[PDB]
Curated annotation (Swiss-Prot), chain A:
Oligomer and partners: Complex I is composed of 45 different subunits. Interacts with CHCHD4.
Topological category with respect to the lipid bilayer: Peripheral membrane protein
Species assigned in the record: Mus musculus
Main localisation: mitochondrion
Composition bias, Basic and acidic residues: 1-6
Endpoints of the signal sequence: none
Protein name: NADH dehydrogenase [ubiquinone] 1 beta subcomplex subunit 10
Subcellular location: Mitochondrion inner membrane
Keywords attached to this entry: Electron transport, Membrane, Mitochondrion, Mitochondrion inner membrane, Phosphoprotein, Respiratory chain, Transport
PANTHER family: NADH DEHYDROGENASE [UBIQUINONE] 1 BETA SUBCOMPLEX SUBUNIT 10, NADH-UBIQUINONE OXIDOREDUCTASE PDSW SUBUNIT
Gene Ontology annotations of biological process type: aerobic respiration; proton motive force-driven mitochondrial ATP synthesis
Composition bias, Pro residues: 7-17
Family affiliation: Belongs to the complex I NDUFB10 subunit family.
Keyword Iron belongs to the record: no
Swiss-Prot record, chain B:
Record-given protein name: NADH dehydrogenase [ubiquinone] 1 subunit C2
Pfam families: NDUF_C2
Any one of the GO CC terms: mitochondrial inner membrane
A GO BP annotation: negative regulation of reactive oxygen species biosynthetic process
Keyword Calcium: no
Subcellular location: Mitochondrion inner membrane
Keyword vocabulary terms for this entry: Electron transport, Membrane, Mitochondrion, Mitochondrion inner membrane, Respiratory chain, Transmembrane, Transmembrane helix, Transport
Protein function: Accessory subunit of the mitochondrial membrane respiratory chain NADH dehydrogenase (Complex I), that is believed not to be involved in catalysis but required for the complex assembly. Complex I functions in the transfer of electrons from NADH to the respiratory chain. The immediate electron acceptor for the enzyme is believed to be ubiquinone.
Annotated organism of origin: Mus musculus
PANTHER family for this protein: NADH DEHYDROGENASE [UBIQUINONE] 1 SUBUNIT C2-RELATED, NADH-UBIQUINONE OXIDOREDUCTASE SUBUNIT B14.5B
């Protein structure tokens, strides 16, 4: 729908270019299908659309504002920890949906490129592998009881490994 | 242990200090539970003596309910007083002995390094 989140290259089709002096049953069946099925269906949907527009109603998104993270939180203060764990779990669900979006992009690219996919579907491939490695360095080796504190301990161990690495000249 | 507490009156159900506590509501869940216990007591009394149930001893049942509530009110008042006294003496002792209960000052999760335990 939003073609910046869900990009779709334009469906360039070749002109028919026929050689036979003979008919194609596809096209005339398409005409019949249109003037039989698509016309009453479009009538019904236009009716339903104008009846929506008679009494239109709106809904919103609930922007959630940021909160003191758990690193700014004291050992034992259960209220701050609760709020921080909640915003973490929120971001976690959002990250899963991001990963789903990128997997969807990858699959759709694979299908449209079809056979010649392993040369011109590498962009979405790398955009999948990078975010995958992020998720792996962010949420992977936890368990069912994941939490902000566990992700933080993981990040801290990894930063320690990186410090010990860059210690080497 | 609170028997040797100073000013402790011997065999005083409700000292005058307890009158400064707020009383119950009289609609407390535990007093209506005691009334329910009295009603079930009357019902069981009738069941044991081969009598009808919920029909026979309405004066006895009313008396059971009222006795249970009229005892539970004062017993609960005494218990509220005793728990008040517990908190009172605890607060006084921590306020008199702060060296044993120091003003602890805890840290954040950015400065402490809790260890990571993968699942894998
Ligand atoms: C809501 C529902 C409530 C629950 C409904 C009832 C549930 C039925 C099951 C109860 C079984 C468990 C009861 C255990 C219990 O009562 O506490 C043990 C309780 C623990 O004692 P303690 O607080 O460690 O020290 C008591 C001192 O020795 C003695 O020093 P004291 O200063 O504590 O004085 C004793 C105090 C005791 O009065 C009481 O509160 C005890 C009444 C309990 C009745 C049981 C119901 O006063 C009296 O004896 C009454 C005298 C009144 C004089 C006239 C006015 O035992 C007693 O006090 C024995 C007192 C016997 C007095 C007769």
């Amino acid at each position: 729908w939003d073609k910046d989140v869900y990009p779709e290259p334009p469906s360039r089709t070749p002109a028919p270019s026929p050689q036979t002096s003979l008919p194609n049953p596809i096209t005339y069946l398409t005409k019949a299908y249109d003037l039989v099925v698509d016309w009453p269906v479009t009538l019904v949907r236009e009716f339903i659309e104008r009846q929506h527009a008679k009494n239109r109603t709106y809904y919103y998104h609930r922007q959630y504002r940021r909160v003191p993270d758990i690193t700014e939180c004291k050992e034992g203060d259960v209220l701050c920890i609760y709020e921080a764990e909640m915003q973490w779990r929120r971001d976690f669900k959002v990250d899963q949906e991001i990963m789903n979006i990128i997997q969807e992009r990858l699959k759709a690219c694979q299908q449209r490129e079809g056979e010649n996919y392993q040369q011109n579907c590498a962009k979405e491939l790398e955009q999948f592998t990078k975010v995958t490695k992020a998720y792996q360095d962010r949420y992977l080796d936890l368990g069912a009881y994941y939490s902000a504190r566990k992700c933080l301990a993981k990040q801290k161990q990894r930063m320690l490994e990186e410090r010990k690495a860059a210690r080497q000249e | 242990m609170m028997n040797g507490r100073p000013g402790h009156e011997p065999l005083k159900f409700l000292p005058d200090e307890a009158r400064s506590l707020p009383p119950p509501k009289l609609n407390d869940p535990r007093l209506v539970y005691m009334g329910l216990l009295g009603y079930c007591t009357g019902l069981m009394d009738n069941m044991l003596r081969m009598r009808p149930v919920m029909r026979a001893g309405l004066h006895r049942q009313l008396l059971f309910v009222t006795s249970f509530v009229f005892a539970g009110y004062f017993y609960l008042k005494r218990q509220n007083y005793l728990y008040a006294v517990k908190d009172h003496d605890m607060f006084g002792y921590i306020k008199l002995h702060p060296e044993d209960f120091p003003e602890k000052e805890k840290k954040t999760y950015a400065e402490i390094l809790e260890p990571f335990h993968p699942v894998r």
